[PDB]
Amino acid sequence: MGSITENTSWNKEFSAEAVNGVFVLCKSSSKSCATNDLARASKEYLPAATFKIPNAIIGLETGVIKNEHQVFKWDGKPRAMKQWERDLTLRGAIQVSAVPVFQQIAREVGEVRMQKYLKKFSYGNQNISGGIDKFWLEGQLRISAVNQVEFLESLYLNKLSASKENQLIVKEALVTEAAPEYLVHSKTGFSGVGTESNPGVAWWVGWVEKETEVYFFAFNMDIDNESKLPLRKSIPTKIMESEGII
Amino acid sequence: SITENTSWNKEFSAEAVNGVFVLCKSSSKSCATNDLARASKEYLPAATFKIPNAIIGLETGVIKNEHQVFKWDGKPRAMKQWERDLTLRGAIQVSAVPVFQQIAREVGEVRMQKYLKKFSYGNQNISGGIDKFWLEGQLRISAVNQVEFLESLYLNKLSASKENQLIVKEALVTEAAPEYLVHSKTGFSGVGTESNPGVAWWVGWVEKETEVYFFAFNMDIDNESKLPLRKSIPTKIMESEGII
């Protein structure tokens, strides 16, 4: 992206909902971005499940994921959500955001390989200390909403340090909503409800392919109350509906 | 093998529609149909040919890559929705015939023929005009053949880079949900003439859970108003089988 501008009027939705948060929306053809808050747009947060994006990419590249037709066989042990207690494809694993699958991918990737790809991808603060299967969840990895849109735009252009086919595979895995007139590729994130003072963070990042334009977006909010969670989709949607995008 | 499923003709009787549905679970070695004779009968592909045409355009460099924009020259096009710049998915999704006609002209007769031979695409007959053999020419393809072709595409087994196959596959996404993804393309030759009906198509595949279902539907049609039956009849069979 080439420019960012602040549209304070985009705080209407956040205020309406009593939410501390940011939305960044960028247009590929002008390489220009808008946000409600420049400051929060550059603040860095645990990526949570948004990290499945780079992790899918590295697992593909390293051959820890064979190809897009890979089945992740459920062994039969209880998992944190009923949604995960089944065999899964990559898209499947991504869409039901199955943590144990990507924890296992992270473990086959390994500290060394994981660490390298994040430097090539310029992925946030690139800090994977705090457990190879835990670092994006409760460790010290941080990424900003601006850095998310930049990572995603590189993905969209196949300009990440991976094979073109592996980037394509992951973009298809990210398809979340399809219509004749638009295609949405997106991924949610939720680190937890936080603790004393210190709230968790919820994310929604992706892009919308519409007419011959592409809108990249990244949303995060502070969250202490798990019921406020759906706002990670409804607030960006409101802003993107306002803009006549979707 | 192809096996008749007797209960499927029910949907065809109800709308007074001669057509065929072919459905394959996992691979094309085990497919089911309402009619064994009609399953392998060959019809004009119409806009289902945008599939091989898109792959060929990519393979030949005619379409530079996935972000190619097909610019509208400003000249009259047969549908208002085609009168605009379009991306590859865009052109596939509104079925922009002129985008694909120009694709075909640049590919040229010699290359077009070679790729259809390579892909085993129907009778591989491109006679009738480089920019219209699939519309009104001598090109014919069966439901069974569509399913075979889509299976090769799905498996990245066509004679084309995997990257190009992936590109066309994402252009075909038509419905997305956490548990399933549908890639599909409609076709419609037209309404035909006295005693010679046109054909309507819905073909593609559903990736659901850990399984893949390949489908091809066609029907004889002499009335544009009957056109939504090309989606509803097959959706009604796939819904009954718990697939969508």
UniProtKB/Swiss-Prot annotation, chain B:
Any one Gene Ontology molecular-function term assigned to this protein's record: penicillin binding
Xref: Gene3D superfamilies: DD-peptidase/beta-lactamase superfamily
Cystines in this chain: 24-31
One cellular component term from this protein's GO annotations in UniProt: periplasmic space
Localization, UniProt: Periplasm
UniProt EC number: 3.5.2.6
Any Pfam family matching the protein: Transpeptidase
pH curve summary: Optimum pH is between 6 and 7.
GO biological process terms on file: antibiotic catabolic process; cell wall organization; response to antibiotic
PROSITE patterns assigned: BETA_LACTAMASE_D
Keywords for the protein's UniProt record, in alphabetical order: Antibiotic resistance, Disulfide bond, Hydrolase, Periplasm, Plasmid, Signal, Transposable element
Activity regulation information from UniProt: Activated, with respect to most beta-lactam substrates, in the presence of 0.05 M sodium bicarbonate.
Residues with N6-carboxylysine modification: 50
Catalytic activity: a beta-lactam + H2O = a substituted beta-amino acid
Active site per the UniProt annotation: 47
Reported function: Class D beta-lactamase which confers resistance to the beta-lactam antibiotics, including penicillin, carbenicillin and oxacillin, and also some cephalosporins. Confers weak resistance to some carbapenems, in E.coli strain C600Z1. Acts via hydrolysis of the beta-lactam ring. Has penicillin- and cephalosporin-hydrolyzing activities.
Protein family: Belongs to the class-D beta-lactamase family.
Subunit organization: Dimer.
Protein name per UniProt: Beta-lactamase OXA-10
Organism expressing this protein natively: Pseudomonas aeruginosa
Lineage: Bacteria, Pseudomonadati, Pseudomonadota, Gammaproteobacteria, Pseudomonadales
